[PDB]
Amino acid sequence: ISNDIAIDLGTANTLIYQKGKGIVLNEPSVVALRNKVVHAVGIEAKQMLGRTPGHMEAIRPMRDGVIADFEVAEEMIKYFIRKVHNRKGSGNPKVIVCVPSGATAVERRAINDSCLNAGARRVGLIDEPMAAAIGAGLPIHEPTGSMVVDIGGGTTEVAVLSLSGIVYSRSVRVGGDKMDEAIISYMRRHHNLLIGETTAERIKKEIGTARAPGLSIDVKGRDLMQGVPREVRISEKQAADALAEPVGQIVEAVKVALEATPPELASDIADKGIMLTGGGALLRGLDAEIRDHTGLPVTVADDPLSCVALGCGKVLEH
Ligand SMILES: Nc1ncnc2c1ncn2[C@@H]1O[C@H](COP(=O)(O)OP(=O)(O)NP(=O)(O)O)[C@@H](O)[C@H]1O
Ligand SMILES: N=C(N)SCc1ccc(Cl)cc1
Ligand SMILES: [Mg+2]
């Protein structure tokens, strides 16, 4: 049995693929500190967001394709590696870490050292868009242009790939987080109601959509003037309005990617289509929106949230 693992350190979720097993951990990238000291990591910690008492704090070491808090991140990483380490397993843990293309050497050097103090002896790195493409099952080894769009929590990465390499690759600070922000702003600018990020993220999943039809839900927030709990009903349409901008910035980046794609490679993409991954790819109607604005066929990968991890794992086994 092996202790070799691949890690996808996301702003929102962290996944770990273990050689021989598969994906063996899937927990939010949240750490809870009590007055500091590591109190809870992952699933527990996330449930505390916007609900912590005065002597506690719920943190996301990564926010927007970066590591805003390095020390808390190191603990998170260490905890997850610790949590999945198999004492009956071999040593010399080989560790592949997924990393964005907009990744500074500062962020890399830290990621690396963090694994070494966690028990890693060797540490390899792999590009997120590559890991995503592989996980989604694209023929990134063949002589054909394959375009992948990994919409995550803090960033979206659009990349064209072929011959085991990257033809084009760009990262934009837009994703789920900003999609949540947009909903929070909409509720504030149109219903004078303040809502939390948890409530926002739930609205996104329950009625969020890139395009209006309709369907509706009840939002539990607070009225700004009299500062007391109130709830307003919101519709699929209203939801689309809130999300128009962040959705638009995704579509744009997808176009910019194409304009920068040589004619031959661009055709291969129009044949099979564009592949969306990441949790942001689960936003209803997003694939359809991109499809319309680009004219190209769009397909949502299977288990979008796991593509990067599964792509990293495939490499770990070869
Ligand atoms: N059904 C859904 N509809 C809309 N958004 C969703 C849905 N499910 C998950 N998300 C969002 O997907 C985002 C995280 O997806 P994820 O692919 O895990 O990104 P990440 O890898 O964790 N972080 P990063 O890649 O660095 O941007 C979160 O913002 C979620 O809110
Ligand atoms: N998974 C992503 N592409 S965003 C978070 C991140 C992960 C690693 C490093 Cl070094 C920086 C930011
Ligand atoms: Mg990601």
- Please provide residue 152's backbone torsions phi and psi, each rounded to the nearest 5 degrees: -105, -155
Sheet architecture: strand order including 94-99:
22-28, 13-18, 5-9, 94-99, 122-127
- Between the CA of 130 and the centroid of ligand 1 the distance, in Å, is 18
CB 281: neighbour CB atoms within 10 A?
25
Compute the distance between CA of residue 317 and CA of residue 299 in angstroms, rounded to an integer: 27
Method used to determine the 3D structure:
X-ray
Which domains are present in the chain? 1-136+305-318 (3.30.420.40), 143-173+247-304 (3.30.420.40), 175-246 (3.90.640.10)
- Between the CA of 87 and the centroid of ligand 1 the distance, in Å, is 32
CA dihedral 171, 172, 173, 178 (to 10 degrees): -130
Q: Which of 283, 302, 307 to mutate to test the pocket of ligand 1 (most atoms within 8 A of CB)?
A: 283
CA dihedral 72, 77, 82, 88 (to 10 degrees): -170
Q: Which of 29, 30, 173, 204 to mutate to test the pocket of ligand 1 (most atoms within 8 A of CB)?
A: 204
* Cβ–Cβ < 8 Å for 291, 255: no
Give the resolution value in Å.
2.6
- Between the CA of 227 and the centroid of ligand 3 the distance, in Å, is 37
Compute the distance between CA of residue 7 and CA of residue 80 in angstroms, rounded to an integer: 9
Residue closest via CA to ligand 2's atom 8 equals 99
* Cβ–Cβ < 8 Å for 179, 205: no
- Per-position DSSP letters for 238-280, written without gaps between them: HHHHHHHHHHHHHHHHHHHHHHTS-HHHHHHHHHH-EEEESGG
* Cβ–Cβ < 8 Å for 164, 183: no
197-207 helix and 176-191 helix, angle to the nearest 10 degrees: 100
Residue closest via CA to ligand 1's atom 9 equals 279
Tokens of 289: 């929106």
As for the chain, the residues directly before each break of C–N over 2.5 Å are 35, 213
Q: Which of 13, 97, 99 to mutate to test the pocket of ligand 2 (most atoms within 8 A of CB)?
A: 99
Residue closest via CA to ligand 1's atom 27 equals 152
* Atom from ligand 2 closest to the CA of residue 65: 4
Ligand 1 proximal residues by C-beta, below 6 Å: 10-13, 65, 152-155, 175-177, 201, 204-205, 208, 278-280, 282-283, 305
